[PDB]
Design an enzyme around this catalytic site. Structure first.
Site, PDB file in Angstrom:
ATOM      1  N   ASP B 178      30.377  38.170  51.000  1.00  0.00           N
ATOM      2  CA  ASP B 178      30.494  38.691  49.746  1.00  0.00           C
ATOM      3  C   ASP B 178      29.758  40.178  49.180  1.00  0.00           C
ATOM      4  O   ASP B 178      28.541  40.154  49.484  1.00  0.00           O
ATOM      5  CB  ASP B 178      29.854  37.500  48.803  1.00  0.00           C
ATOM      6  CG  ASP B 178      30.299  37.618  47.360  1.00  0.00           C
ATOM      7  OD1 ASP B 178      30.617  38.670  46.929  1.00  0.00           O
ATOM      8  OD2 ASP B 178      30.333  36.586  46.596  1.00  0.00           O
ATOM      9  N   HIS B 270      42.779  36.985  45.862  1.00  0.00           N
ATOM     10  CA  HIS B 270      41.820  37.317  44.985  1.00  0.00           C
ATOM     11  C   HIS B 270      41.687  38.910  45.136  1.00  0.00           C
ATOM     12  O   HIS B 270      41.424  39.577  44.034  1.00  0.00           O
ATOM     13  CB  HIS B 270      40.307  36.636  45.318  1.00  0.00           C
ATOM     14  CG  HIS B 270      39.199  37.016  44.491  1.00  0.00           C
ATOM     15  ND1 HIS B 270      39.156  36.678  43.298  1.00  0.00           N
ATOM     16  CD2 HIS B 270      38.008  37.637  44.962  1.00  0.00           C
ATOM     17  CE1 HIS B 270      37.971  37.065  42.710  1.00  0.00           C
ATOM     18  NE2 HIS B 270      37.173  37.838  43.803  1.00  0.00           N
TER      19      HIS B 270
HETATM   20  C1  HEM Z   1      32.505  32.456  42.421  1.00  0.00           C
HETATM   21  C2  HEM Z   1      33.311  33.355  41.951  1.00  0.00           C
HETATM   22  C3  HEM Z   1      33.856  34.466  43.030  1.00  0.00           C
HETATM   23  C4  HEM Z   1      33.703  34.368  44.329  1.00  0.00           C
HETATM   24  C5  HEM Z   1      33.199  33.360  45.274  1.00  0.00           C
HETATM   25  C6  HEM Z   1      34.270  35.652  44.889  1.00  0.00           C
HETATM   26  C7  HEM Z   1      34.387  36.050  46.343  1.00  0.00           C
HETATM   27  C8  HEM Z   1      34.891  37.166  46.789  1.00  0.00           C
HETATM   28  C9  HEM Z   1      34.857  37.424  48.121  1.00  0.00           C
HETATM   29  C10 HEM Z   1      34.671  36.681  49.311  1.00  0.00           C
HETATM   30  C11 HEM Z   1      35.550  38.735  48.236  1.00  0.00           C
HETATM   31  C12 HEM Z   1      35.849  39.788  49.446  1.00  0.00           C
HETATM   32  C13 HEM Z   1      34.695  40.420  50.021  1.00  0.00           C
HETATM   33  C14 HEM Z   1      34.348  41.450  48.941  1.00  0.00           C
HETATM   34  O1  HEM Z   1      34.986  42.380  49.056  1.00  0.00           O
HETATM   35  O2  HEM Z   1      33.110  41.130  48.515  1.00  0.00           O
HETATM   36  C15 HEM Z   1      35.553  39.446  46.819  1.00  0.00           C
HETATM   37  C16 HEM Z   1      35.831  40.532  46.340  1.00  0.00           C
HETATM   38  C17 HEM Z   1      35.904  41.079  45.123  1.00  0.00           C
HETATM   39  N1  HEM Z   1      35.896  40.189  44.119  1.00  0.00           N
HETATM   40 FE1  HEM Z   1      35.238  38.441  44.013  1.00  0.00          FE
HETATM   41  N2  HEM Z   1      34.466  36.406  43.647  1.00  0.00           N
HETATM   42  C18 HEM Z   1      34.170  35.721  42.745  1.00  0.00           C
HETATM   43  C19 HEM Z   1      34.296  36.284  41.247  1.00  0.00           C
HETATM   44  C20 HEM Z   1      34.739  37.227  41.268  1.00  0.00           C
HETATM   45  C21 HEM Z   1      34.873  37.954  39.917  1.00  0.00           C
HETATM   46  C22 HEM Z   1      34.811  36.984  38.233  1.00  0.00           C
HETATM   47  C23 HEM Z   1      35.320  39.057  39.709  1.00  0.00           C
HETATM   48  C24 HEM Z   1      35.550  39.720  38.440  1.00  0.00           C
HETATM   49  C25 HEM Z   1      35.807  41.176  38.337  1.00  0.00           C
HETATM   50  C26 HEM Z   1      35.434  39.418  41.220  1.00  0.00           C
HETATM   51  C27 HEM Z   1      35.830  40.835  41.424  1.00  0.00           C
HETATM   52  C28 HEM Z   1      35.945  41.222  42.769  1.00  0.00           C
HETATM   53  C29 HEM Z   1      36.176  42.394  43.292  1.00  0.00           C
HETATM   54  C30 HEM Z   1      36.328  43.559  42.382  1.00  0.00           C
HETATM   55  C31 HEM Z   1      36.119  42.542  44.524  1.00  0.00           C
HETATM   56  C32 HEM Z   1      36.444  43.665  45.704  1.00  0.00           C
HETATM   57  C33 HEM Z   1      38.113  43.407  45.772  1.00  0.00           C
HETATM   58  C34 HEM Z   1      38.806  44.604  46.591  1.00  0.00           C
HETATM   59  O3  HEM Z   1      38.725  45.747  46.020  1.00  0.00           O
HETATM   60  O4  HEM Z   1      38.853  44.703  47.912  1.00  0.00           O
HETATM   61  N3  HEM Z   1      35.029  38.447  41.809  1.00  0.00           N
HETATM   62  N4  HEM Z   1      35.228  38.339  45.882  1.00  0.00           N
END
Ligand code: HEM
Ligand code: HEM
Lengths: 360, 361
Positions: B178, B270
């Protein structure tokens, strides 16, 4: 980096007792479900033994929901303990140590059922809180069928590397806490901690008294700073007894001041708590807790007081009774709100499981 | 220097705790102003809190510290102060509230609770050591108690210091790496994405924070198909690589299709719905994990303290959160927002100023 470090799971003793205390702990207190007898208790302990055998060495448990959280074991340890109700459900009252019963009442007690008692203890300690959270999840996954969660008590010490190994750390009242303790690797430690009498299955194990003690940090901040040292019998910054200069000087309980009154008060904590004979000392291995705030800004914090000893009746109760009947000055600012007692079995090897000598 | 004696500078053009590589522990303290706390009282409070932070972050006891021996070993302690929408009303300074500083609009996945939402004043305290953190929290409350009520306290954790090499991505409580795609501190794209340069003058050099408490439905997650778990995100669990690639930092190929001609990274994965092409529009994610207690039948209360920092909530947070919601993010099956709060984080100060002086002075 320290994430790869481990503590041995197998041995004559369970880990988590003589193990130098890790930065984080969870004490999980479980009550047995109605249908959980000796047969079920064996199935549960074999499950939990194998979970610990794998997770403590950085390997996923069988049926691990999140295997990627099992690497970086960070000195994870499991210590399992059996409460008085475990022996009842197993039909093994003959095997229960005479002293394994709820502690007698003390005048200072303000005990709550939600922090007291319990049939089965899983004590999980770890230098890392993610590894610890994962180990707790696996424990509950395998215990859910047999037990209900009675309480979960989370605590912390300093992070790894913040202080050198073995140095005394402070509690949330700012006091150095842990100066006088039996030392692993000495004959006195073995005599104080490891059971060698009583029922045969417990030899090489120990007993645990777990007391949740609230700190009245509101009152404590208002307290006279000289009065705070007088209540303990040691200085805050140095940890030295009021009769001495360094933390590890021996307190002189015969010393009087220029007016003829004891330097260490007759009701100072360390005077009432002291025992002359090193082999009668309890092993204190406490954790700190801090949990949220009222609207007007009042803290909810204190000590998870964990005392290990071969004999509760000979090594814990006499000290607690003196603190109570002697009117320990520290009682003005501390309040017991939970109390539980457990018998901790000896360790096992690759071809055994924890509690096998009792339950098998 | 050790893990305990290390410090982070308190003074600077920016407040610490944002570009600071995230420490092992955090507490987000959410405060409501009492009725009599106006502009004058807020200035006295912010001067008190600034001077306590100035001392404690460098290992010195606060002014009138009740437990001074807990102040050495600062362990990279940082404070970050934030102003909620209601603050500007109480100060008589509505004209200075950024247009975009307002509670987030409702989203279909929301199950928001008042006890985890809102707040007039934020104190974000981060530290590598939980005893130092506990003492810093108590000193903050000691000085704020006269002017405020505690609306919530949210504690979270990451890996302990020294457990992983620095900079390496860490896992959340679902086991996922993450933080892979994030603005990197010390780069031009970070400054453009994070630090405010338009709007009311007092906020230039500051940022905005969206704090969302997101529950993880770990019972459902455990029953989930392991291939479906990776498919929901768009990345592999162990390596963290996108499903189209092999290493964590490989760029995801959003055009790749599988043997059936369907996207390798699902249309509602996601990372597809959350992705934005312009690096300067990205949000800084600086999350902490939380784990708080168990029901009698062993159900966890765990999740993510999702902390997102960005110059413009309307341009950088809302469009992403809206795409996740309307796009039907597969990860929504296992995550639930239960709290939401927004804060304007002022610029930093110098050895004679105080945090918020450009607004409250
Ligand atoms: C418990 C809730 C959430 C979990 C477990 C989660 C988990 C993850 C994971 C595993 C990744 C891929 C690895 C990384 O690039 O960090 C990711 C990417 C991302 N998450 Fe979340 N996320 C959550 C909520 C959110 C929310 C509410 C947002 C709202 C904006 C968000 C925005 C993003 C963004 C912007 C990325 C990067 C995507 C990219 O451009 O590749 N996440 N998240
Ligand atoms: C929140 C509650 C308590 C606090 C803050 C506290 C604090 C302290 C402190 C500061 C010391 C001196 C340094 C040391 O040797 O560790 C000490 C010693 C000690 N405490 Fe406590 N204590 C608490 C509860 C208890 C209880 C319930 C017992 C019950 C048996 C106990 C038994 C002892 C013993 C045996 C010593 C060593 C005394 C000696 O021989 O010098 N403590 N404690």
């Amino acid at each position: 980096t320290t994430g790869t470090a481990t503590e041995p799971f197998h041995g004559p003793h369970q880990a988590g007792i003589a193990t130098p205390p890790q930065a984080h702990a969870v004490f999980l207190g479980l009550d047995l479900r109605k249908g959980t007898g000796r047969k079920e208790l064996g199935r549960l302990m074999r499950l939990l033994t194998d979970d610990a055998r794998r997770l403590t060495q950085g390997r996923p448990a069988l049926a691990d929901p999140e295997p990627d959280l099992a690497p970086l074991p960070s000195r994870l340890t499991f210590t399992f303990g059996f409460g008085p109700g475990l022996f009842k459900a197993a039909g093994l009252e003959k095997q229960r140590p005479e002293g394994l019963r709820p502690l007698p009442p003390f005048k200072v007690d303000r005990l709550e059922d939600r922090w007291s008692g319990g049939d089965l203890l899983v004590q999980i300690c770890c230098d890392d809180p993610i590894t610890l959270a994962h180990a707790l999840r696996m424990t509950v996954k395998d215990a859910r069928a047999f037990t209900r969660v009675r309480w979960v008590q989370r605590g912390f010490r300093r992070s790894p590397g913040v202080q050198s190994s073995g140095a005394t750390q402070r509690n949330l009242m700012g006091q150095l806490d842990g100066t006088v303790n039996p030392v692993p690797g000495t004959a006195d430690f073995d005599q104080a901690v490891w059971v060698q009498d009583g029922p045969e299955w417990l030899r090489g194990g120990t007993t645990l008294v777990l007391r949740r003690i609230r700190m009245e940090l509101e009152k404590w901040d208002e307290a006279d700073p000289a009065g705070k040292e007088f209540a303990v019998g040691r200085r805050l910054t140095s940890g030295a007894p009021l009769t001495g200069r360094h933390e590890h000087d021996g307190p002189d309980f015969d010393a009087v001041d220029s007016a003829g009154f004891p330097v260490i008060a007759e009701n100072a904590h360390i005077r009432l708590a002291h025992v002359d004979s090193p082999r009668l000392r309890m092993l204190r291995r406490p954790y700190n807790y801090d949990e949220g705030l009222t609207a007007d800004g009042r803290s909810d914090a204190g000590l998870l007081f964990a005392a290990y000893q071969a004999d509760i009746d000979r090594q814990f109760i006499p000290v607690q009774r003196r603190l109570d009947e002697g009117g320990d000055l520290l009682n003005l600012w501390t309040t017991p709100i939970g109390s539980a007692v457990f018998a901790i079995p000896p360790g096992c090897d690759e071809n055994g499981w924890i509690g096998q000598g009792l339950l098998g």
